[model samples]
Structures are given as structure tokens and as C-alpha cells.
Target: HHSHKIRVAHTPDADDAFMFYAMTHGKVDTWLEIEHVIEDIETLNRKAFNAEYEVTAISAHAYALLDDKYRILSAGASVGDGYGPVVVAKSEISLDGKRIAVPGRYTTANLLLKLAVEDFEPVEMPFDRIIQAVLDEEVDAGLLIHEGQITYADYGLKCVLDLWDWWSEQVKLPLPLGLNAIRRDLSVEVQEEFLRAMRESIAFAIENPDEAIEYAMKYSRGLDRERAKRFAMMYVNDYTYNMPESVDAALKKLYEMAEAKGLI
Candidate 1:
């Protein structure tokens, strides 16, 4: 049997790197030949609009716009149960009427921010520079995603709000931040193979974290090895191994809420 080469794009973050490390590094059996591309979450989301890659990771918010071209897979979700994107400021302060640096315009975190509060002014920039923007006094607060949720504290930023708390109190479901999507035109066999490989990849990574984290650290931004591992584990868990049935309802609720508020 011949293998089809599928180009896969994912954000350059610790959890994604770890999830794909095993498959991309030849640790798991894959039916399709995989080509890996690394980009930020927002770039991947934008690229998905044009079907730039056969498979790409898109934010949950972006999926609402691209659901016709791509199908979300169960594996590789960045979900938060009781904690999610954290809003932080140089000091503990309210988010009302303040300027906040957000990673991207369509990120799930930004959407959550919109649903949480209606008065703040959002400034869009690359995620890496958000903390510095807050530190430099360029914005009143920052909407942090990825490892920033953990590392923000080292910078003396105080959590002004946790979107997880707000979302859970509203819906009582796990928050899905990022999702892996495959081109809808892909053959069903390829889709099934992709699912199998995706599950195996995450399983292998969690089982063999040392090597996985070694590879993930390349995207871990400057987090120490231990912190990087912790951050990776936080996102790549049971929910990511294979999404629970509740995820569909949770995602539907997310979109429903966003729609009710006209944020989507």
C-alpha cells in the first residue's frame, strides 16, 4: 500500500509539539506520510481559510468559520477543565474599560474575553509579545494563552480573571481552546488512519515524555524543562487523547453563547 503525504500545520507551542512529536519523529505507525509545519495559532487559523494544509490546528473560535472545509478530529484538543486562558495585569486590577493585548482577533481566548466582558478595548499582537506589552505599560492587561498561563506569574503579573472560571460557571463544561482539523475532502480511510495515528502519537508522547518534552522544548519558549513538561501535560491529557462525548455539547454551547452575544 502506498502512503499519501499529508501536510499538517500546528501552532509552535509545547503541547502541540508534544502531541505530534511521536508521529512526526517516527515513533508511531502512520498510514499517511506526514509533513509538519510550525506556525502560531492565529496563522494556522488564517491558513485554514484557504485550505493551506491538509490538516491544521485551528482555534475553537476559528473553527466556526472553517467548519465547511475542515473536520475536527478527536485528538489534539487543548482543553481546560477548571482553568483556561488567564487575564493578567501588572497588578491585580479590573478588566472593565481597560486596554488588553490579545494574541489574535479570532482566538478562542479572545472570544471568551469578549463574552466575559463587553467594555474592554482589545489590542491584537503576537502572543509572545503580549506579556512584554503589558510590562512595558503599553496595555492595561494581557490575554494570555499557551505557556503564558504558567509563566506570567514569574513576570509578576497578577491574574485579574480566569476565563475558565467564568465559562464553567456559565456552562459547567470543559473549555476547548484549540482543535485539530483535517480537510473534508480527505478519503475516509485516510481520516480513520489519521485518527488512529493521532491517538497513538499522544499516547506515546505521554508515555515517553522525556524525549517528547525534549522536542517540545524547542517551542516551549524559555520555560525550564520542568515547567515545560508541566505545561505540556496540562493541555495534552485524556480530553486530548480522544475528546469526550461532552465536547460536542460543550463546543455547541460555546458557539451558541458566542452567537447569542453576536461575538462570532
Candidate 2:
């Protein structure tokens, strides 16, 4: 047997990390150990496609554009159940004609917003910076991802809209939160072994939430155990262990739309 090392590029989303973390827990020797490096969604996309790692987690939309180079090893659960990007604003304000903030131009949250609201102006800023910008009235509303979504209510922001809910209303399809992919040229045995590891990891997480929570909280950035647990739950679902046809279609549709608009 060839002992191959699988290097992973993961995002901050807890579920993506869990998949690999659990997979390698016991069989480190056979897998030749695994290493995880974290990056933002966009960077993850670029590096994964460039073949910087054996496997990486990327948003479904990104997977669509890079599918020719990468094959889906695992699909994660829906973050928003179909709509996850949230639009937040001050309590007294109305959403009509609001200036909305997005972390980046090509982000899934931005794409969701663009599809839902026809006339809203988008303000681009870091996810951490969006709250302050909204508080200062720099923008009438903000679309938050990562830890920002969990803490938005604590910051005195009102929920103007939930992108996940909006997405469910629009498409009646669950949104793809993220996917783990390997290069297409990787051998079939390697792919199957990797997939089996992920499946085992998902079962481990479920059977042992406490251990999984501890593992997740230890490396999670800027989130405490409780919040980390909550944040983790938001994205990881049944889809984490297995990919369904609807999820695949949604991913393909997103990639096609992104390409048509020249966003990818």
C-alpha cells in the first residue's frame, strides 16, 4: 500500500474542519498524517484549484467554477437551510432603498443578496468591520457571515432579512454551505479512503458531541465554547456526511450564474 499524506485546506466553518479532524483521529499511520491550514473562503477557492493541498473546503459556488479541476469528496450541510446570509439594520429602519454591506463581491452572501433585492446598494467591507459600519450608519444594513451572524443580535442590530429564509422562498432548494474536494487526478482508492474517513468523522461527531465541541472550540477563532457550538450547528447537517442530488444541482446552478455574470 502506498502511504500518502493528505494535506487539507479548511475554512473557519466548524463543520469542514470536523470532517477531516474526525477522519484522521485513529488511522493517522495509514493516512501518513494530515495537516490543516485555514484561509478565507476566496483564498481557499484559489488555493484548492491551484492544487496547493490534497483536499480543501470551498463554498459550493466556488466548487462549480473549479469542478473541472476538483471533484467533490464530500458535501456539507446547509448553513441557512436554503437562506443563510442575513441582512441586519437598526430596529427603526426599513429595508427599502437600504445600503447593504457585504464582506466581498463574490461571496455567497453577496450573491444571495443580489438575487433577492433588486435596488439595494452593496458596501464591501470585512465581516468584522460590517457591524461597526452599520452602527455608525455607514450602511443601512449589513450582510454578515462567520461569527458575525451569531453575534449580530448582541450588537443592537435588528434582523432586516435572513438570506437563508429568502433563498428557501425563492428556490425551494437548500443552499450549499461548503464542500470538501480532492483533485480529479487523485487515484480512486485514495478518494474512497478519504470519503470513508469523512463518513466516520461525521458519525463520531454525532455520537460524541462533547468531544467534538471541545475539539471545535479549541481551534475556532474568536468564539467561545457555547457560541462555537452554536456556530457549528448552523452549517453542519445531514449533508455533511453525504451529498444529495438537490445540493449538487444548486451548486451547479450557482456556478453557472456566477460565470454568466463574469464573477468567477
Candidate 3:
């Protein structure tokens, strides 16, 4: 009945569910009633524009411009250690003057595409649909940000470029993908409670592996429990439970690099 009950918008990924399982299931206490909204990364990014939710999972690229309204919650982030978004296609083709379907304008995946390559046209679409768009030959390539990073091969898609490999050549830190941020409108007490709840929930998930896996299965996209566990564990790292200075330093450098190229 209370769909508007102080929403925290996060992705529909299994990792996302793993992070929120405890809080959603009464394992953690909060200052007020809360609910989770399941949307794709792009949708979450776009929703951040109007302050659609009290808290949200947003791309680092999107946060570049919206930091005024939101501050990141250190409790969780979807960072790629050595692997991140990939550009995939049905066959090898020169990217020069080719059309590539992007996840969204503000997604870090899209930002990386712009930073790494300069001669392609971007066809913006949902991240979930980009794989299919590439396979159907609707676009020359698709930038994958979520599960498709590993599952594209099952669809007969070939990797054209791995942003992580290129980023590694230039930087020595992990890739900052998505982060959970809280709206500035909330009271400090509420914000702190939100952070506490998140920390507890994540710790709960980590301590109770089978519980997290079983609950997270609801959000898994065609992935078997094992594959889903891999996906969840990949993004749910130490950084997912505690924000470190290194991650912050990496974000500063990442934004600076993107800015230097006038990509953001």
C-alpha cells in the first residue's frame, strides 16, 4: 500500500539483492519505514535527476554532475577490480564510423566508451537490451555493464573491447561503476541510520552466504545459482561494505581523466 515508503532505488542485479536482503527482511533496523525499488542501472541513473528516491544506486559518471543533491554511501559500490564493462558484437568489425548501442548517456560504461573511442555513433538504449540489439545486428556493437559482461558469450557475442583492460593500461586502481548515494534532503540522523542499516545488511549477507545466495536468486537474470553467486561476489567486496580512501582517490582520478578528455 505504501509504494512511496522512502524508496532506495537500486539495480535488479543479484548483487543488489544480496546487499539489501537483510534490511528488506527485517534483519536490520532503520529510522523510518523503507522499501527497495528494482530498476536497471540506466533507469536508476535517470531517476536520480528528479530526486526520485531518498537513496539510489547511481553510476560514477552520473554522480559527477549530481553530487550537489546526493553524497555517496560508503556501505556499497559496484566496482570492477580488473574486469568491467565490455563492448561486444556478433563479429569483429572496425569501430570507426560504426554505430554502437550505449547503455545510457550518464552511465560510466557509456562515459568509458566515449573516452576510449572517438569515431563511433552512440545509440542509447537499456543495458539489458543492448546485447540483443548487437546480436540482431541492429547495432554494430553494444556496451555491456551488468551480467552481460560474462554471459555475452552464451549469446554468441564476441568481445570487441574490454574497458577494464584499456583502463588498466592507464590507471592502477579499480573501475568505479555504480555507487549507492543518499539524497541531501534527508536529515543527518536519517542518513546515518541509512548507512548503519546498509552496513548491517551487507555484513549479514557476507556472514550468511547461503541466505544471501538464496534470496538474491529472485533478482538473478536467467543465471543459475552458481553463476549468480559469482556475479554477486564479484561486486560485493570489501569496498561494498566499507568505502576506502583508495576507492575515493580512484574516483577523483577517474573523473579528472574523463574531464581532461572533455568526455564528461
Candidate 4:
């Protein structure tokens, strides 16, 4: 029997799928019943603004706005050590004052883009479509998240900037892209329990990589087994189970930059 029902939301990405496999597949035990909500990262970010779910994965940029309503979960973060979201263009071109397709206005990818190139005109769209939109010349460039970052080259797109690399070069820390946050109204014990469950789930995935990768493939968005596995493994490593001091400092620096830029 469950003592509580917690509504959980996360992106339909391989990394997220791998992390939550234990909970979703009944491999982990908890007193709370988790009702999982699957949506894109941008949609999850928007829904989070209204306090729509008890626990949710959000763009690190979105977390700043909901800081009053939610508490950050140290586990389940998607931190890019030397690689992350990328900005791709159909051809070698200057980004100055060019129209660019973005995943969402509130996405960390978009925030990073804003920080990197302040003068581009943003045309927001679904994360998966940004690449095609660029190929069709709908936008001069596109900021891609998720698997698109790795697959854009397949469409003959050229990478103008890898935000993770730029961030790593400038800040010297893993770039924090996505995070799991729990509503503040949840009891501290409940929150801690949830965190523990998350850590367990992530560890289970790490221990059983092949099984988790196969499960994650269901949401791979056309990525073949190898690419899908790579995507899942890229985001779910030591950082997924716990935040290191360096990652924490990077998050703080990100928030500070967002605040200074009036984005938060």
C-alpha cells in the first residue's frame, strides 16, 4: 500500500528513460506511488511554472524561476562535462543578427545561446524540429538539445558552436543542463526518500547498462541502438547519481549569470 501519490514528470529522452527505469519497471521500492508523466523537456519546463507536478525534470534555466516552489534534487541532473547542446547551421555563416530556431525560450540551451550570442533573433520550436527547420532554411541556425545535438551532422549541418565546450572553456566546470526538482510542499523526509529512490534507480541503470539502454531505446527518437546507447550513457554517469562540488559550483555560476542577464 502506498502512503502517498507523487506526480512525477520528466523528458522523453534516453537519459531520463535510463535513470527512471528502476522506478518505472518496479525494480525499486518506495512507500510512495509515483505517477510518471512523460513529456518533452520544454513542455515539462512550462508545466513546472504552474506547479503542475510534485516532481519534475526541468531546464536548469527554468529552475531559477520556480526556486520558490521547488527544491533541487541533487541526483538525476544532466550535466555536460565537455559536451552539451550545440548550435548548428546549414552552412558556415555568421550568427550576428541571424534568425535561429530554439527549443524553447526557457531552455538551458537557449539561455546558453543567449549568453554566447546576444544578437540573434530567436524563433522557438520543438527541440527535434530545430534541425530540420535549419535544413529547410527556416532559420539561419538552430540550437539543438537531446539526440539532435549528436545527429545534426547526419543532415549535413555544420556545428558552429558546442555550448558545452564554450562553457567548459569559459567556466572550467561541467555545464548543468537539466535537473530534477521536487515541490517544496513535500515533507523533508519524503523529499529525501524520493532522492534516495532516484539515486537507486540511476545506480541500477549503471549496473545494468544493457537492459537500461534497451528500455531507453523506446524513446530514442529514431536513433539506432548504438547512438541511442551512446546518448543514454552520455548523460547518465557519476553526475546522474550525485552532484559533485564542481558541478554545484557550475550551477551557481549559471544562476548568477542568468540573474545578471535578467533572465531569472
Model 2, 1-264: lDDT tens per residue?
353666767765564555445654662234545666877776786666577777777766666667788888764444456336688888756566788878766567777677667667887677668888889989888888776776778878877778777777646667876677788877787787777666777767766666777767645766777777666666665777787777777776766666676566
lDDT of 1: 0.89
lDDT of 3: 0.85
TM-score of 1: 0.97
Sorting all predicted structures by TM-score, with the top scorer first, yields 1, 4, 3, 2
Worst 10 residues of 1 by lDDT: 1-10
Which 10 consecutive residues of model 3 have the lowest summed lDDT?
Answer: 1-10
Return model 1's CA RMSD, one decimal.
1.2
Model 3 lDDT per residue over 158-221, tens place: 8889899988887888888889999998887777777888899888888887788898898788
Structural similarity to truth (TM-score) of each candidate:
0.97, 0.83, 0.94, 0.96
- Lowest lDDT 10-mer window, candidate 2? 23-32
Q: Where does model 3 exceed 4 Å of error?
A: 1-5
RMSD values, in order shown: 1.2, 3.0, 2.6, 1.4
Give candidate 3's error at residue 32 in angstroms: 2.6
- For model 2, the local distance difference test gives 0.69
Q: Write the per-residue lDDT of candidate 4 for residues 1-264, one digit (tens) a residue.
A: 333778989878888998899889999988888899999888988889899999999989988888999978999898887789988998888798999998898889889989888787999788777877888898899988888888888898889887987787668888898998989988877788899899999999989988988888889888998898788888998988898998889889998987888877
